[PDB]
Scaffold this active site. Structure first.
Site, PDB file in Angstrom:
ATOM      1  CG  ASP A  60     -10.351  -6.603   1.959  1.00  0.00           C
ATOM      2  OD1 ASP A  60     -10.835  -7.717   2.261  1.00  0.00           O
ATOM      3  OD2 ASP A  60     -10.001  -5.771   2.812  1.00  0.00           O
ATOM      4  CD  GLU A  97      -2.222  -6.603   6.455  1.00  0.00           C
ATOM      5  OE1 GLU A  97      -2.913  -6.071   7.363  1.00  0.00           O
ATOM      6  OE2 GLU A  97      -2.547  -7.647   5.828  1.00  0.00           O
ATOM      7  CG  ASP A 116      -8.188 -10.225   8.077  1.00  0.00           C
ATOM      8  OD1 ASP A 116      -7.451 -10.055   7.067  1.00  0.00           O
ATOM      9  OD2 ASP A 116      -9.248  -9.581   8.309  1.00  0.00           O
TER      10      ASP A 116
HETATM   11  C1  LIG Z   1     -13.670  -4.718   5.411  1.00  0.00           C
HETATM   12  C2  LIG Z   1     -12.315  -4.074   5.142  1.00  0.00           C
HETATM   13  O1  LIG Z   1     -12.377  -2.766   5.719  1.00  0.00           O
HETATM   14  C3  LIG Z   1     -11.210  -1.964   5.616  1.00  0.00           C
HETATM   15  O2  LIG Z   1     -10.889  -1.679   4.258  1.00  0.00           O
HETATM   16  C4  LIG Z   1     -11.817  -0.861   3.546  1.00  0.00           C
HETATM   17  C5  LIG Z   1     -11.642   0.624   3.862  1.00  0.00           C
HETATM   18  O3  LIG Z   1     -11.879   0.919   5.245  1.00  0.00           O
HETATM   19  C6  LIG Z   1     -12.597   1.385   2.964  1.00  0.00           C
HETATM   20  O4  LIG Z   1     -12.459   2.794   3.215  1.00  0.00           O
HETATM   21  C7  LIG Z   1     -12.305   1.142   1.504  1.00  0.00           C
HETATM   22  O5  LIG Z   1     -11.008   1.670   1.225  1.00  0.00           O
HETATM   23  C8  LIG Z   1     -10.723   1.784  -0.165  1.00  0.00           C
HETATM   24  C9  LIG Z   1     -11.056   3.164  -0.697  1.00  0.00           C
HETATM   25  O6  LIG Z   1     -12.469   3.415  -0.635  1.00  0.00           O
HETATM   26  C10 LIG Z   1     -10.599   3.263  -2.147  1.00  0.00           C
HETATM   27  O7  LIG Z   1     -10.831   4.611  -2.596  1.00  0.00           O
HETATM   28  C11 LIG Z   1      -9.125   2.899  -2.353  1.00  0.00           C
HETATM   29  O8  LIG Z   1      -8.237   3.916  -1.825  1.00  0.00           O
HETATM   30  C12 LIG Z   1      -7.051   4.046  -2.598  1.00  0.00           C
HETATM   31  C13 LIG Z   1      -7.159   5.174  -3.617  1.00  0.00           C
HETATM   32  O9  LIG Z   1      -8.192   4.875  -4.524  1.00  0.00           O
HETATM   33  C14 LIG Z   1      -5.822   5.311  -4.344  1.00  0.00           C
HETATM   34  O10 LIG Z   1      -5.872   6.390  -5.246  1.00  0.00           O
HETATM   35  C15 LIG Z   1      -4.692   5.543  -3.350  1.00  0.00           C
HETATM   36  O11 LIG Z   1      -4.891   6.793  -2.655  1.00  0.00           O
HETATM   37  C16 LIG Z   1      -3.692   7.544  -2.622  1.00  0.00           C
HETATM   38  C17 LIG Z   1      -3.850   8.721  -3.563  1.00  0.00           C
HETATM   39  O12 LIG Z   1      -3.765   8.252  -4.889  1.00  0.00           O
HETATM   40  C18 LIG Z   1      -2.768   9.778  -3.377  1.00  0.00           C
HETATM   41  O13 LIG Z   1      -3.271  10.955  -4.007  1.00  0.00           O
HETATM   42  C19 LIG Z   1      -2.403  10.052  -1.914  1.00  0.00           C
HETATM   43  O14 LIG Z   1      -3.466  10.796  -1.311  1.00  0.00           O
HETATM   44  C20 LIG Z   1      -3.044  11.641  -0.236  1.00  0.00           C
HETATM   45  C21 LIG Z   1      -2.155  10.948   0.783  1.00  0.00           C
HETATM   46  O15 LIG Z   1      -3.055  10.057   1.395  1.00  0.00           O
HETATM   47  C22 LIG Z   1      -1.719  11.985   1.812  1.00  0.00           C
HETATM   48  O16 LIG Z   1      -0.867  11.413   2.754  1.00  0.00           O
HETATM   49  C23 LIG Z   1      -0.935  13.084   1.143  1.00  0.00           C
HETATM   50  O17 LIG Z   1       0.104  12.526   0.319  1.00  0.00           O
HETATM   51  C24 LIG Z   1       1.352  13.085   0.669  1.00  0.00           C
HETATM   52  C25 LIG Z   1       2.209  12.132   1.498  1.00  0.00           C
HETATM   53  O18 LIG Z   1       1.578  11.828   2.721  1.00  0.00           O
HETATM   54  C26 LIG Z   1       3.566  12.777   1.766  1.00  0.00           C
HETATM   55  O19 LIG Z   1       4.436  11.830   2.348  1.00  0.00           O
HETATM   56  C27 LIG Z   1       4.193  13.331   0.499  1.00  0.00           C
HETATM   57  O20 LIG Z   1       4.705  12.300  -0.307  1.00  0.00           O
HETATM   58  O21 LIG Z   1       3.309  14.151  -0.227  1.00  0.00           O
HETATM   59  C28 LIG Z   1       2.109  13.504  -0.583  1.00  0.00           C
HETATM   60  C29 LIG Z   1       1.266  14.416  -1.472  1.00  0.00           C
HETATM   61  O22 LIG Z   1       0.872  15.561  -0.750  1.00  0.00           O
HETATM   62  O23 LIG Z   1      -1.967  13.711   0.361  1.00  0.00           O
HETATM   63  C30 LIG Z   1      -2.437  12.943  -0.741  1.00  0.00           C
HETATM   64  C31 LIG Z   1      -3.418  13.777  -1.591  1.00  0.00           C
HETATM   65  O24 LIG Z   1      -4.809  13.782  -1.184  1.00  0.00           O
HETATM   66  O25 LIG Z   1      -2.202   8.826  -1.226  1.00  0.00           O
HETATM   67  C32 LIG Z   1      -3.375   8.037  -1.213  1.00  0.00           C
HETATM   68  C33 LIG Z   1      -3.096   6.855  -0.296  1.00  0.00           C
HETATM   69  O26 LIG Z   1      -2.982   7.324   1.022  1.00  0.00           O
HETATM   70  O27 LIG Z   1      -4.666   4.462  -2.449  1.00  0.00           O
HETATM   71  C34 LIG Z   1      -5.851   4.296  -1.688  1.00  0.00           C
HETATM   72  C35 LIG Z   1      -5.623   3.124  -0.736  1.00  0.00           C
HETATM   73  O28 LIG Z   1      -4.686   3.456   0.269  1.00  0.00           O
HETATM   74  O29 LIG Z   1      -8.895   1.633  -1.752  1.00  0.00           O
HETATM   75  C36 LIG Z   1      -9.226   1.593  -0.364  1.00  0.00           C
HETATM   76  C37 LIG Z   1      -8.740   0.261   0.188  1.00  0.00           C
HETATM   77  O30 LIG Z   1      -7.313   0.153   0.084  1.00  0.00           O
HETATM   78  O31 LIG Z   1     -12.320  -0.248   1.219  1.00  0.00           O
HETATM   79  C38 LIG Z   1     -11.518  -1.086   2.073  1.00  0.00           C
HETATM   80  C39 LIG Z   1     -11.711  -2.541   1.652  1.00  0.00           C
HETATM   81  O32 LIG Z   1     -13.048  -2.998   1.893  1.00  0.00           O
HETATM   82  C40 LIG Z   1     -10.020  -2.707   6.198  1.00  0.00           C
HETATM   83  O33 LIG Z   1      -8.839  -1.924   5.999  1.00  0.00           O
HETATM   84  C41 LIG Z   1      -9.896  -4.081   5.544  1.00  0.00           C
HETATM   85  O34 LIG Z   1      -8.819  -4.787   6.149  1.00  0.00           O
HETATM   86  C42 LIG Z   1     -11.172  -4.875   5.765  1.00  0.00           C
HETATM   87  N1  LIG Z   1     -11.115  -6.266   5.250  1.00  0.00           N
HETATM   88  C43 LIG Z   1     -10.714  -7.366   6.164  1.00  0.00           C
HETATM   89  C44 LIG Z   1     -11.757  -7.453   7.243  1.00  0.00           C
HETATM   90  C45 LIG Z   1     -12.613  -8.475   7.382  1.00  0.00           C
HETATM   91  C46 LIG Z   1     -13.548  -8.407   8.565  1.00  0.00           C
HETATM   92  O35 LIG Z   1     -13.040  -9.304   9.545  1.00  0.00           O
HETATM   93  C47 LIG Z   1     -12.632  -9.672   6.467  1.00  0.00           C
HETATM   94  O36 LIG Z   1     -13.961 -10.043   6.120  1.00  0.00           O
HETATM   95  C48 LIG Z   1     -11.859  -9.383   5.192  1.00  0.00           C
HETATM   96  O37 LIG Z   1     -11.691 -10.651   4.551  1.00  0.00           O
HETATM   97  C49 LIG Z   1     -10.517  -8.749   5.531  1.00  0.00           C
HETATM   98  O38 LIG Z   1      -9.646  -8.650   4.397  1.00  0.00           O
END
Ligand SMILES: C[C@H]1O[C@H](O[C@H]2[C@H](O)[C@@H](O)[C@@H](O[C@H]3[C@H](O)[C@@H](O)[C@@H](O[C@H]4[C@H](O)[C@@H](O)[C@@H](O[C@H]5[C@H](O)[C@@H](O)[C@@H](O[C@H]6[C@H](O)[C@@H](O)[C@@H](O[C@H]7[C@H](O)[C@@H](O)[C@@H](O)O[C@@H]7CO)O[C@@H]6CO)O[C@@H]5CO)O[C@@H]4CO)O[C@@H]3CO)O[C@@H]2CO)[C@H](O)[C@@H](O)[C@@H]1N[C@H]1C=C(CO)[C@@H](O)[C@H](O)[C@H]1O
Ligand SMILES: *[C@@H]1O[C@H](CO)[C@@H](O[C@@H]2O[C@H](CO)[C@@H](O)[C@H](O)[C@H]2NC(C)=O)[C@H](O[C@@H]2O[C@@H](C)[C@@H](O)[C@@H](O)[C@@H]2O)[C@H]1NC(C)=O
Ligand SMILES: *[C@@H]1O[C@H](CO)[C@@H](O[C@@H]2O[C@H](CO)[C@@H](O)[C@H](O)[C@H]2NC(C)=O)[C@H](O)[C@H]1NC(C)=O
Ligand SMILES: *[C@@H]1O[C@H](CO)[C@@H](O)[C@H](O)[C@H]1NC(C)=O
EC number: 3.2.1.20
Length: 827
Positions: A512, A416, A413
């Protein structure tokens, strides 16, 4: 305000004489642009036939080597040593043309139908259609016939449809992003697409693969597809097909044939993040048995470890002596054990694995020192799986652990690689701050987000920028080697992160997902996609990983999931428990559907053999069997297991029917042979689907060898075979059965400890003949396998030994290894 680029002109071009023709050309940049960084001034361009059915187009810097996926990682044939230049071969359907326009273009079309498959002719006024070739920005575009081209692939992404929707961007950059998120780049990168044409010559299919491990966006607008890639080279393969199955044969010949799986890996698997101690996992095993629900493999997630460290046991909750007793008991009862491993090694100075890793200098570096991430145990270093010393270390750690606690397979697991922190970019580095931003996480988020930074370094002075997408794949190669070196059985591993070619080493699961009706359906396109990717051992977490499931959702999910090639119930720790025995209605459905799955074990296993031989997926799209039926191209909620069995699940709460597409002909329920569907032109049928039932049907023209139900696959293998023969008025019926000991390292190899049986059935005007042909009768005979019953469907008259009816020929007591010919008469 400068243009993105100006493209290239052909400076020279010629087709080799005196060998299997290949074409070589030199291209020169028309004009520079500052946008997206330095243009490569001179390109070497080759088109060559690797095989009659595979064309390779390789575009490199004429004056410098650039990053390419190493041959050791993905072994493959080496590169060849107005006005147009044409490359054609008499035995190949693919015709290549180089157009000496300004900027230049190229096309590939079919000699037979003249259908243009890939058309990189630029629109002169429109640089978005040019070949642009900058150090960190490669742009390659093809027009497509919008109504006729049906595209599939370009993983890994969750989508509601299998056929790619028009007007989207697909980003390939391995990332720890949950598969419950639609659209976003996920754990794996598979820069392959299949293109099925509805005309001319309905069902004519080809494949297109860009052999490149760099981050990319692929923009598909229906009438065009454009790659925007942030490094490497263009190394483009076109596979001629013309059938979908031929395309996957051709593709997997290049990237690697699907690894075989041991027979037991087709049994049911149970896992949960959050099992507290050895008593809990024992109780789960006991409760499965008490409920009479088959359970083959018990898994432990990171709970088993001492404070989330690989190669350790929690001395309080999972003490060694109790774990040894637990595994011994599993083994005595015909069951198996799989633990998880993460790649990151905790940096505690009194942890043996860390000490040894340091001693052998196995870790990825940045700025000259080991790169420090954060994962479950806190601070970690990451083994460099490009480094032979790290692979040796990994093998040794697995050996050491297996020597203390037996295991049957490994779940890798977080590979990446996942990192819970994002490091600051190296000032001034265009690797950490690339000029073109791919659409990482749907937000143009920097590539280093929650992973290892691009400026980190690997064996051979290779950057993470270039090697990132290979990490999971490389870990998979190393882990399979570790298992092979420590057991002579066919190994089993499951990996989260993947790349094209990973299927030669590992299974995958969709990651996930969530306990949602949407995700129940999303599992189908993803299952189908991974077949195309050469990774046929695929499934999703049954009842959903994230969020609490419901009784109804879990009942419908085991109904569907009992037919995934890889069938596992797994859950996150913060949710309700979802072992199948917890609700009676779920338990009862589970017994029904796992009963049929287990009867189908010889069939799944044969399909696994077929996949290793030819790349053909176990769970496959309807259009693999019915490529001349355009109605099947857009199906995303039904699938085939092998050639002629179709699964048509309910995917909505409260539903007691499902509107399901049936291709032409007669189809019989595997749960009740008296229940059938007959259609002329393929159409939708509103199937009854009460809460306790899933629709699974077999089509006329097919023969499937079943064995009996049992609580373990070993017990199942000792039961009699029952042959299911489904007659067709129009064609003879056929089927296949592959047999070995379930665990041979080299499946179907020269050692000969295997048998292949082919079955045939044909009606005459007054008779019916059923027969078999056997390769290597010896093995099957020595294993005592008996064929005791034949059931004949699809006729309207009963048959016997010398609406539709069902005829049963019982108590045959025949050896499967002995070829037979049985003559039946009508009554
Ligand atoms: C157990 C499990 O745990 C872990 O995974 C968990 C995680 O920890 C939890 O938090 C949760 O995560 C979820 C989350 O709750 C959800 O909301 C969603 O997130 C996604 C958003 O919904 C989606 O919209 C998008 O987000 C985007 C935004 O859309 C976008 O607006 C922008 O937002 C930001 C940027 O972030 C900023 O950087 C900046 O953007 C800039 C940019 O940086 C510049 O370069 C330039 O381009 O300008 C821009 C604009 O200014 O500001 C923006 C504005 O606010 O980007 C966002 C992304 O960054 O995507 C989100 C996802 O990334 O989904 C997530 C999950 O993906 O749940 C998960 C899952 O449970 C571990 O990670 C996971 O591995 C674990 N599972 C394993 C573990 C075990 C245990 O051994 C096993 O049992 C399992 O089998 C394993 O798989
Ligand atoms: C490195 O591993 C050591 C051995 O497991 C940790 O020390 C041990 O921590 C136990 C539980 O946290 C504690 O009950 C033990 O008494 C202790 N053992 C010894 C021999 O010191 C160590 O943990 C850190 O350092 C100790 C001294 C405590 O302050 C802990 O709270 C610390 O977390 C591990 N080091 C790190 C950096 O985690
Ligand atoms: C298998 O399916 C058949 C067809 O639906 C079932 O037979 C029908 O049963 C109903 C009563 O439930 C009768 O009214 C019909 O006359 C029957 N049809 C035929 C063609 O005989 C049969 O009961 C099913 N078998 C099982 C075990 O459920
Ligand atoms: C009976 O089957 C044989 C082959 O098994 C076929 O050649 C023959 O035509 C059939 N005869 C009748 C009378 O149906």
């Amino acid at each position: 305000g400068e243009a993105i680029g100006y493209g290239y002109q052909v400076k020279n071009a010629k087709v080799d004489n005196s060998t299997g023709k290949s074409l070589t050309a030199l291209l020169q940049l028309i004009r520079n642009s500052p946008v997206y960084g330095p243009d490569i001034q001179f390109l070497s361009f080759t088109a060559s036939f690797e095989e009659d059915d595979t064309l390779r187009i390789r575009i490199t810097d004429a004056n410098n080597r650039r990053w390419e996926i190493p041959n050791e990682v993905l072994p493959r044939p080496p590169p060849p040593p107005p006005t147009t230049t044409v490359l054609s071969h008499p035995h190949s359907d693919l015709v290549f043309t180089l157009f000496h326009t300004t900027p230049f273009g190229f096309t590939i079309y079919r000699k037979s139908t003249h259908d243009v498959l890939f058309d990189a002719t630029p629109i002169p006024s429109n640089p978005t259609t040019f070949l642009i070739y900058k150090d960190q920005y490669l742009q390659l575009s093809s027009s497509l016939p919008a109504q006729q081209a049906h595209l599939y692939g370009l993983g890994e992404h969750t989508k509601p449809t299998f056929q790619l929707a028009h007007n989207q961007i697909l980003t390939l950059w391995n990332a720890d992003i949950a598969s419950f998120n639609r659209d976003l780049n996920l754990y794996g990168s598979h820069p392959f697409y299949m293109d099925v044409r509805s005309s001319p010559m309905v069902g004519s299919t080809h494949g297109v693969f860009l052999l490149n491990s760099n981050g990319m966006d692929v923009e598909y607008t229906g009438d065009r597809i454009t790659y925007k890639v942030i490094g490497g080279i263009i190394d483009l393969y076109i596979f001629a097909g013309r059938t979908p199955e031929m395309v996957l044969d051709q593709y997997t010949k290049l990237i690697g044939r699907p690894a075989p799986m041991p027979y037991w890996a087709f049994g049911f698997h149970q896992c949960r993040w959050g099992y507290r101690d050895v008593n809990e996992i024992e109780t789960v095993v006991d409760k499965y048995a008490e409920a009479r629900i088959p359970l083959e493999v018990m898994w432990t997630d990171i709970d088993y470890m001492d404070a989330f460290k690989d190669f350790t046991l929690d001395p309080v909750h999972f003490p060694l002596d109790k774990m040894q007793q637990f595994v011994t008991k599993l083994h005595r009862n015909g069951q198996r054990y799989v633990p998880i491993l993460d790649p990151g090694i905790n940096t505690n100075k009194s942890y043996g694995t860390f000490i040894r890793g340091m001693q052998s200098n196995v870790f990825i570096k940045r700025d000259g020192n080991p790169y420090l991430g954060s994962v479950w145990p806190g601070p970690v270093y990451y083994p460099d799986f490009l480094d032979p010393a790290a692979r040796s270390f990994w093998v040794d750690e697995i050996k050491r652990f297996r020597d203390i606690l037996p295991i049957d397979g490994i779940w890798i697991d977080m590979n990446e690689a996942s990192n819970f922190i994002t490091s600051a970019p190296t000032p001034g580095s265009t690797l950490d701050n690339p000029p073109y931003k791919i659409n990482n996480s749907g937000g143009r988020v920097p590539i280093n987000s929650k992973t290892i930074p691009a400026t980190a370094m690997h064996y051979g002075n290779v950057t993470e920028y270039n090697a990132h997408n290979l990490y999971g794949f490389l870990e998979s190669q190393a882990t399979r080697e570790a298992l092979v070196r420590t057991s002579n059985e066919r190994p089993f591993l499951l990996s989260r992160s993947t790349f094209a070619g990973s299927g030669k080493y590992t299974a995958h699961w969709t990651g996930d997902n969530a306990a949602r009706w949407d995700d129940l359906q999303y599992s189908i396109p993803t299952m189908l996609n991974f077949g195309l990717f050469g990774m046929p051992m695929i499934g999703a977490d049954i009842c959903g990983f994230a969020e609490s499931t419901t009784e109804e959702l879990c009942r419908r999910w085991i109904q569907l999931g009992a037919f995934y090639p890889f069938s596992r119930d797994h859950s996150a720790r913060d949710t309700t428990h979802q072992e199948l025995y917890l609700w009676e209605s779920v338990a009862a459905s589970a017994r029904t559907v796992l009963g049929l799955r287990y009867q189908l074990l010889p069939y799944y296993y044969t399909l696994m053999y077929d996949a290793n031989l030819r790349g053909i997926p176990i769970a496959r799209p309807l259009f693999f069997t019915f490529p001349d039926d355009v109605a099947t191209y857009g199906i995303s909620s039904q699938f085939l297991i092998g050639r002629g069995i179709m699964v048509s699940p309910v995917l909505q709460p409260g539903a007691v029917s499902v509107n399901a597409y049936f291709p032409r002909g007669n189809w019989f329920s595997l749960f009740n042979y008296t229940s059938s569907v007959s259609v002329s032109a393929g159409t939708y049928v509103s199937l009854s689907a009460p809460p306790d039932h899933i629709n699974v049907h077999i089509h006329e023209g097919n023969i499937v060898a079943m064995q009996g139900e049992a609580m373990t696959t070993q017990a199942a293998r000792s039961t009699p075979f029952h042959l299911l023969v489904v007659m067709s008025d129009h064609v003879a019926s056929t089927g296949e059965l592959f047999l070995d000991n379930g665990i041979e390292m080299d499946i179907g190899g020269p050692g000969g400890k295997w048998t292949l049986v082919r079955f045939f059935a044909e009606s005459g005007i007054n008779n019916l003949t059923i027969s078999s042909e056997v390769v290597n009768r010896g093995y099957a005979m020595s294993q005592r396998w008996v064929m005791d019953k034949i059931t004949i469907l699809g006729l309207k008259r009963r048959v016997r030994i010398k609406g539709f009816v069902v005829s049963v020929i019982s108590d045959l007591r025949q050896l499967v290894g002995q070829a037979f010919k049985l003559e039946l008469e009508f009554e």
